[PDB]
Design a protein around this ligand. Structure first.
Ligand SMILES: Cc1ccc(-n2nc(C(C)(C)C)cc2NC(=O)Nc2ccc(OCCN3CCOCC3)c3ccccc23)cc1
Length: 276
């Protein structure tokens, strides 16, 4: 049933080169995969730890069942699964520069605005496809965006793979679990702020109850330093209280494409939370 959405890979074609992360029930590694065409590519490899239960196997492979449904340049690519041998494995494309928030923090103010908008456009395009497919992410955050050696950004849910993430969640989803593509659009607004602020934490370390209350009262994150007015306005639109008034992802992609094609528009800039 995982094989409905995931190719079975022969473990003979996989080399594990490094353990990258580990937990109580599994590990994340990097390595190489030899494709049926004999081409070899870099991959990430999730393995279950030796001695796992059948239910752990089922839950583990459930992740690949979901991932394999999405084939898009800006969504993490599932290469396949290993189920016929042990340990069971999930194999994905390798994203050399890791999570976007931590990457941008290492490079504060070192990219052009156009480069940043390129990243954001990729993220929007992956989300447009996810929402087209009827899938609500619910965990969209810069930490769950993976960025490769060419700065291409891909939607993942590394977080879940590794409670409501309050800082990234729309008011109605916090209030009563109303998760829709419009709540993902709210989350995308926060990612937009994270990118333009080079990986600053949304709402910093405010008490969660105050994040909920402030946003409910109408307060919003302030424009990042030197933020293009167009991009801050886009944040505010993603953060409309009325979920029906938020832009669709297709509109977001369109807006970002227009800005990329006409960079001059990004020279108009804005000038703890803001009400007005
Ligand atoms: C239960 C569950 C169900 C579904 C998901 N889920 N849903 C999605 C969609 C919807 C966005 C397509 C994506 C995911 N899961 C993931 O995005 N999973 C992963 C993220 C990062 C990884 O590698 C990170 C290591 N890599 C090293 C190099 O630097 C970058 C990070 C992974 C390595 C091996 C296997 C899975 C990985 C998650 C959990």
């Amino acid at each position: 049933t995982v094989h409905e959405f995931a190719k079975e890979l022969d473990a003979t074609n996989i080399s594990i080169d490094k353990v990258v992360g580990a937990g109580e029930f599994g590990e994340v590694c990097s390595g190489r995969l030899k494709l049926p065409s004999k081409k070899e590519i870099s991959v990430a490899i999730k393995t279950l730890k030796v001695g796992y239960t059948e239910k752990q196997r089922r839950d583990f492979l459930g992740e690949a069942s979901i991932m394999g449904q999405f084939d898009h340049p800006n969504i993490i690519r599932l290469e396949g699964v290993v189920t016929k041998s042990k340990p069971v494995m999930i194999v994905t494309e390798y994203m050399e520069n890791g999570s976007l928030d931590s990457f941008l923090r290492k490079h504060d103010a070192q990219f052009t605005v156009i480069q940043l908008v390129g990243m954001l456009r990729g993220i929007a395009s992956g989300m447009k496809y996810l929402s087209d497919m009827g899938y609500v992410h619910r965990d969209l955050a810069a930490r769950n965006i993976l960025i490769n050696s060419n700065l291409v950004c891909k939607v993942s849910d590394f977080g879940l793979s590794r409670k409501i993430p309050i800082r990234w969640t729309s008011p109605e989803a916090i209030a009563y679990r109303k998760f829709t593509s419009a709540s993902d659009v709210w989350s995308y607004g926060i990612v937009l702020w994270e990118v333009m602020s080079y990986g600053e934490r949304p709402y910093w370390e405010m008490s969660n109850q105050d994040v909920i209350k402030a946003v409910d009262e109408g307060y919003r994150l302030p424009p990042p330093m030197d933020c293009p007015a167009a991009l801050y306005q886009l944040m505010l639109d993603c953060w409309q209280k009325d979920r029906n008034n938020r832009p669709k992802f297709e509109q977001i992609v369109s807006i970002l494409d227009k800005l990329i094609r006409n960079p001059g528009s990004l020279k108009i800039i804005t000038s703890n939370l803001l009400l007005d």
